[PDB]
Protein backbone atom coordinates (compact mmCIF):
# COMPACT_ATOMS: atom_id res chain seq x y z
CA UNK A 1 0.00 0.00 0.00
CA UNK A 2 2.26 2.46 1.13
CA UNK A 3 5.14 1.81 -1.14
CA UNK A 4 4.67 3.35 -4.13
CA UNK A 5 6.72 3.23 -7.61
CA UNK A 6 7.63 6.25 -8.24
CA UNK A 7 8.48 7.18 -4.37
CA UNK A 8 6.48 7.90 -1.73
CA UNK A 9 6.96 11.26 0.48
CA UNK A 10 3.38 12.14 1.42
CA UNK A 11 4.58 11.48 5.21
CA UNK A 12 6.80 13.35 7.09
CA UNK A 13 9.07 13.35 10.09
CA UNK A 14 9.54 16.42 12.19
CA UNK A 15 13.89 16.41 11.72
CA UNK A 16 15.17 19.54 13.43
CA UNK A 17 13.28 20.11 16.51
CA UNK A 18 13.76 22.80 19.73
CA UNK A 19 13.44 20.65 22.70
CA UNK A 20 12.74 16.43 23.50
CA UNK A 21 8.25 16.09 23.61
CA UNK A 22 6.30 15.31 26.31
CA UNK A 23 4.69 12.37 27.05
CA UNK A 24 2.14 11.92 24.04
CA UNK A 25 2.60 15.68 22.40
CA UNK A 26 1.09 16.68 19.07
CA UNK A 27 3.46 19.16 17.26
CA UNK A 28 2.33 20.50 14.39
CA UNK A 29 4.34 23.81 13.98
CA UNK A 30 6.35 24.29 10.76
CA UNK A 31 8.12 27.38 11.74
CA UNK A 32 11.92 27.35 10.69
CA UNK A 33 14.02 26.51 13.15
CA UNK A 34 17.90 27.99 13.06
CA UNK A 35 20.44 26.02 13.06
CA UNK A 36 23.44 28.58 14.46
CA UNK A 37 23.24 31.99 16.24
CA UNK A 38 22.34 33.37 13.27
CA UNK A 39 18.04 34.03 13.32
CA UNK A 40 16.57 32.87 10.14
CA UNK A 41 13.36 35.73 10.26
CA UNK A 42 12.23 32.99 8.20
CA UNK A 43 14.92 32.76 5.55
CA UNK A 44 15.31 29.53 4.43
CA UNK A 45 19.42 30.07 3.94
CA UNK A 46 22.51 28.98 5.47
CA UNK A 47 22.02 27.58 9.06
CA UNK A 48 18.33 26.99 8.55
CA UNK A 49 16.46 23.64 7.23
CA UNK B 1 -10.45 34.65 2.79
CA UNK B 2 -7.80 32.20 0.46
CA UNK B 3 -6.56 34.27 -2.59
CA UNK B 4 -3.79 33.02 -4.36
CA UNK B 5 -3.27 36.38 -6.94
CA UNK B 6 -0.95 35.09 -10.02
CA UNK B 7 1.20 37.57 -12.19
CA UNK B 8 4.33 37.43 -14.17
CA UNK B 9 2.84 35.76 -16.68
CA UNK B 10 3.25 37.55 -20.85
CA UNK B 11 5.08 37.15 -24.21
CA UNK B 12 8.38 35.62 -24.25
CA UNK B 13 10.72 34.24 -26.66
CA UNK B 14 11.66 30.83 -27.59
CA UNK B 15 14.92 29.92 -25.71
CA UNK B 16 14.18 32.71 -23.03
CA UNK B 17 13.15 32.58 -19.27
CA UNK B 18 10.20 34.26 -17.30
CA UNK B 19 9.25 34.38 -13.54
CA UNK B 20 5.61 33.76 -12.38
CA UNK B 21 4.38 34.98 -8.95
CA UNK B 22 1.70 33.93 -6.49
CA UNK B 23 1.01 35.84 -3.72
CA UNK B 24 -1.13 34.44 -0.62
CA UNK B 25 -3.09 35.73 1.90
CA UNK B 26 -6.00 35.39 4.54
CA UNK B 27 -3.88 31.79 5.51
CA UNK B 28 -0.88 30.56 6.98
CA UNK B 29 1.20 30.15 3.66
CA UNK B 30 4.55 28.60 5.38
CA UNK B 31 2.23 25.52 6.34
CA UNK B 32 0.81 24.67 3.56
CA UNK B 33 1.81 22.87 0.12
CA UNK B 34 1.98 24.66 -3.77
CA UNK B 35 2.29 23.67 -6.94
CA UNK B 36 1.86 25.07 -10.59
CA UNK B 37 -0.10 23.49 -13.33
CA UNK B 38 -0.66 24.51 -16.58
CA UNK B 39 -2.91 23.42 -19.62
CA UNK B 40 -2.18 24.17 -23.16
CA UNK B 41 -4.68 25.98 -25.25
CA UNK B 42 -8.02 24.18 -25.86
CA UNK B 43 -6.31 20.98 -24.49
CA UNK B 44 -6.50 19.43 -20.88
CA UNK B 45 -4.53 19.69 -17.73
CA UNK B 46 -1.10 19.33 -16.90
CA UNK B 47 0.41 19.11 -13.74
CA UNK B 48 4.37 20.85 -13.60
CA UNK B 49 5.72 21.69 -10.42
CA UNK B 50 5.14 21.51 -6.48
CA UNK B 51 7.25 22.71 -3.63
CA UNK B 52 6.49 20.96 0.07
CA UNK B 53 7.42 23.97 2.02
CA UNK B 54 11.10 22.88 1.85
CA UNK B 55 13.71 24.41 -0.60
CA UNK B 56 14.67 20.99 -1.49
CA UNK B 57 12.02 18.70 -1.82
CA UNK B 58 10.79 19.96 -5.29
CA UNK B 59 9.20 17.93 -7.77
CA UNK B 60 8.46 18.02 -11.33
CA UNK B 61 6.38 16.61 -14.27
CA UNK B 62 8.72 14.96 -16.93
CA UNK B 63 7.99 17.16 -19.40
CA UNK B 64 9.68 20.00 -17.11
CA UNK B 65 12.03 18.11 -15.43
CA UNK B 66 15.59 19.96 -16.01
CA UNK B 67 14.07 23.14 -17.87
CA UNK B 68 11.45 24.73 -14.92
CA UNK B 69 12.38 25.67 -11.13
CA UNK B 70 10.23 26.30 -8.62
CA UNK B 71 11.02 28.72 -5.48
CA UNK B 72 8.57 30.26 -2.53
CA UNK B 73 8.84 33.09 -0.13
CA UNK B 74 8.61 34.06 3.55
CA UNK B 75 7.75 37.18 4.84
CA UNK B 76 5.29 38.76 2.18
CA UNK B 77 3.81 35.06 1.28
CA UNK B 78 4.58 34.99 -2.44
CA UNK B 79 5.53 31.46 -5.00
CA UNK B 80 7.91 31.95 -7.80
CA UNK B 81 8.27 30.16 -10.65
CA UNK B 82 11.56 30.03 -13.44
CA UNK B 83 11.18 28.83 -16.57
CA UNK B 84 14.05 28.23 -18.60
CA UNK B 85 14.32 27.12 -22.22
CA UNK B 86 10.66 27.22 -23.45
CA UNK B 87 9.74 25.69 -26.30
CA UNK B 88 6.44 26.10 -28.85
CA UNK B 89 4.96 23.35 -26.83
CA UNK B 90 5.11 25.10 -23.72
CA UNK B 91 2.09 27.84 -24.35
CA UNK B 92 -0.08 27.21 -21.38
CA UNK B 93 -2.15 29.15 -18.93
CA UNK B 94 -0.10 28.10 -15.57
CA UNK B 95 -2.07 28.20 -12.36
CA UNK B 96 -0.75 27.95 -8.52
CA UNK B 97 -2.53 25.98 -5.91
CA UNK B 98 -2.86 24.92 -2.82
CA UNK B 99 -2.01 21.35 -1.00
CA UNK B 100 -2.51 19.96 2.75
CA UNK B 101 -1.17 16.81 2.23
CA UNK B 102 1.83 17.82 4.61
CA UNK B 103 -0.21 16.55 7.50
CA UNK B 104 -3.96 16.35 6.58
CA UNK B 105 -4.63 12.82 4.37
CA UNK B 106 -7.93 14.18 3.62
CA UNK B 107 -7.66 17.57 1.86
CA UNK B 108 -4.96 16.04 -0.69
CA UNK B 109 -7.07 17.96 -3.47
CA UNK B 110 -6.12 21.38 -4.43
CA UNK B 111 -8.32 23.31 -2.25
CA UNK B 112 -8.25 26.25 -3.99
CA UNK B 113 -6.60 26.68 -7.27
CA UNK B 114 -5.50 30.55 -8.42
CA UNK B 115 -6.74 32.45 -11.35
CA UNK B 116 -4.39 31.99 -13.55
CA UNK B 117 -1.81 33.77 -16.09
CA UNK B 118 -0.96 33.58 -19.70
CA UNK B 119 2.65 32.50 -21.12
CA UNK B 120 2.66 33.06 -24.48
CA UNK B 121 5.99 31.50 -26.09
CA UNK B 122 6.19 33.15 -29.27
CA UNK B 123 8.98 35.59 -31.31
CA UNK C 1 2.24 6.44 -15.26
CA UNK C 2 -0.81 6.18 -14.16
CA UNK C 3 -3.51 6.36 -17.42
CA UNK C 4 -7.60 6.77 -17.21
CA UNK C 5 -9.34 5.59 -20.16
CA UNK C 6 -11.92 7.81 -19.40
CA UNK C 7 -15.03 7.16 -21.09
CA UNK C 8 -17.18 8.37 -22.72
CA UNK C 9 -15.56 10.80 -23.96
CA UNK C 10 -18.76 13.23 -24.50
CA UNK C 11 -22.57 12.10 -23.44
CA UNK C 12 -25.82 13.76 -23.79
CA UNK C 13 -28.54 14.18 -20.62
CA UNK C 14 -31.26 16.26 -19.99
CA UNK C 15 -31.90 18.59 -17.10
CA UNK C 16 -32.72 16.33 -14.20
CA UNK C 17 -31.08 13.42 -15.58
CA UNK C 18 -28.14 11.08 -13.81
CA UNK C 19 -25.03 11.85 -15.20
CA UNK C 20 -22.49 8.80 -14.41
CA UNK C 21 -18.48 9.63 -16.00
CA UNK C 22 -16.29 6.57 -15.55
CA UNK C 23 -12.46 7.16 -14.81
CA UNK C 24 -9.97 3.84 -14.44
CA UNK C 25 -7.06 3.57 -12.72
CA UNK C 26 -3.92 1.48 -13.19
CA UNK C 27 -2.32 -0.02 -9.96
CA UNK C 28 -5.16 0.10 -7.33
CA UNK C 29 -4.75 3.35 -6.43
CA UNK C 30 -7.53 3.40 -3.58
CA UNK C 31 -9.38 6.37 -3.03
CA UNK C 32 -6.52 8.87 -3.98
CA UNK C 33 -8.24 10.34 -6.82
CA UNK C 34 -10.29 13.90 -7.07
CA UNK C 35 -12.71 15.11 -9.11
CA UNK C 36 -12.85 19.09 -10.77
CA UNK C 37 -15.33 20.90 -12.30
CA UNK C 38 -14.32 23.56 -14.66
CA UNK C 39 -15.88 26.75 -16.82
CA UNK C 40 -15.02 27.99 -20.09
CA UNK C 41 -12.90 30.69 -19.36
CA UNK C 42 -13.04 29.76 -15.33
CA UNK C 43 -10.39 28.36 -12.88
CA UNK C 44 -10.96 24.37 -12.00
CA UNK C 45 -13.19 23.84 -8.54
CA UNK C 46 -13.18 20.62 -7.05
CA UNK C 47 -16.25 18.42 -7.04
CA UNK C 48 -15.19 15.38 -5.36
CA UNK C 49 -12.30 14.57 -3.03
CA UNK C 50 -11.20 11.22 -1.60
CA UNK C 51 -13.69 9.65 -4.24
CA UNK C 52 -16.28 10.17 -1.52
CA UNK C 53 -16.00 13.29 0.30
CA UNK C 54 -17.75 16.38 -1.24
CA UNK C 55 -16.13 20.02 -0.45
CA UNK C 56 -17.28 21.97 2.26
CA UNK C 57 -19.39 25.09 0.40
CA UNK C 58 -20.71 22.93 -2.52
CA UNK C 59 -24.76 22.15 -2.55
CA UNK C 60 -25.58 18.89 -1.68
CA UNK C 61 -26.76 17.81 -5.37
CA UNK C 62 -23.21 16.53 -6.06
CA UNK C 63 -21.76 12.91 -5.10
CA UNK C 64 -19.10 10.36 -5.55
CA UNK C 65 -18.35 7.23 -5.00
CA UNK C 66 -16.03 4.17 -6.09
CA UNK C 67 -13.04 3.11 -4.69
CA UNK C 68 -9.66 1.38 -5.91
CA UNK C 69 -9.59 0.95 -9.65
CA UNK C 70 -12.92 2.43 -10.84
CA UNK C 71 -14.85 5.14 -9.85
CA UNK C 72 -18.73 5.94 -10.52
CA UNK C 73 -19.40 9.09 -10.31
CA UNK C 74 -23.03 10.17 -9.80
CA UNK C 75 -24.69 13.76 -10.36
CA UNK C 76 -27.98 13.58 -8.96
CA UNK C 77 -29.96 16.74 -10.07
CA UNK C 78 -29.22 18.86 -13.46
CA UNK C 79 -28.82 22.63 -12.81
CA UNK C 80 -27.98 25.16 -15.43
CA UNK C 81 -25.33 26.50 -14.13
CA UNK C 82 -23.65 23.15 -14.03
CA UNK C 83 -22.93 23.17 -17.48
CA UNK C 84 -18.92 22.33 -17.93
CA UNK C 85 -16.43 19.67 -18.65
CA UNK C 86 -15.25 17.64 -15.74
CA UNK C 87 -11.50 16.10 -15.26
CA UNK C 88 -9.96 13.31 -12.96
CA UNK C 89 -7.28 13.86 -11.14
CA UNK C 90 -4.98 10.60 -9.52
CA UNK C 91 -3.77 11.60 -7.02
CA UNK C 92 -1.50 8.83 -5.33
CA UNK C 93 1.77 7.91 -6.76
CA UNK C 94 3.69 11.44 -7.11
CA UNK C 95 0.50 13.19 -8.35
CA UNK C 96 1.03 13.67 -12.16
CA UNK C 97 -1.63 12.89 -13.93
CA UNK C 98 -4.95 14.41 -14.71
CA UNK C 99 -7.85 13.19 -17.14
CA UNK C 100 -8.92 13.39 -20.54
CA UNK C 101 -12.10 14.89 -19.49
CA UNK C 102 -15.63 14.41 -21.00
CA UNK C 103 -17.99 17.46 -21.72
CA UNK C 104 -21.55 17.25 -20.54
CA UNK C 105 -24.01 19.26 -21.97
CA UNK C 106 -27.50 19.72 -21.61
CA UNK C 107 -29.79 17.28 -24.11
CA UNK C 108 -31.78 19.12 -26.17
Known amino acids: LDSKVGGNYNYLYRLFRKSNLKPFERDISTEIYQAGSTPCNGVEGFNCY | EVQLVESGGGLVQPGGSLRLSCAAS????????MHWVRQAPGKGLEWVSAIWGSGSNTYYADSVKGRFTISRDNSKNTLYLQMNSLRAEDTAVYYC????????????????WGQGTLVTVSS | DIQMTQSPSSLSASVGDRVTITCQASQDISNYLNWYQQKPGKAPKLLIYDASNLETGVPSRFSGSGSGTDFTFTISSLQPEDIATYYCQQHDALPWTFGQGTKVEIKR
Open chain 2, 97 to 112: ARGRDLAAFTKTAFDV
Open chain 2, 26 to 33: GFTFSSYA
